Amino acid sequence: SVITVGYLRLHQCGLPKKMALELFKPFIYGKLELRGLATTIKAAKKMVE
Amino acid sequence: DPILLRPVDDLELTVRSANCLKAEAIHYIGDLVQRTEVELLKTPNSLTEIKDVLASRGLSLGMRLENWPPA
């Protein structure tokens, strides 16, 4: 993605909220079953969509 | 209650018991729990089975319910 200036602290980076769900999609799937909100991975992907 | 809206097939009851309630057209679990033991002994083909099959389900006959059926 393009870069832009930040108030941010030296250890912090500004992520676009839209790319995070795409990048961490397997992480969302993994922690979603742990939360018990999706019985199956198909429902996990459906509610992510 | 998540059990009231289900039919009588969610009990895994004996075939002798699975057929007796169909005579009186029992459709809901609520329908069978409204009627008490003092009138369900009339139907032929239970007294030593229904209490124990229903206790494990967290239910027992003789409870009073309103707005039934809610459809």
Binding site: T40 | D9, D10
Partner: protein, 51 residues
């Protein structure tokens, strides 16, 4: 259904092992189906219809 094996077995294939009952193995399968058709165990399996 040959689950966890290399192949499945038909009615007579399992009949020659336990009992030569033809329709009775079939009704054992039907009993298994109605056991698995119950809304007591099928709740999670029903989710696998769209794949």
């Amino acid at each position: 259904f040959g689950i966890d094996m290399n192949t499945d077995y038909t009615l007579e294939e399992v009949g020659k092992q336990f009992d030569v009952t033809r329709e009775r193995i079939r009704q054992i399968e039907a009993k298994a189906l109605r056991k698995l058709r119950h809304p007591s165990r099928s709740e999670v399996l029903r989710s696998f219809l769209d794949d």
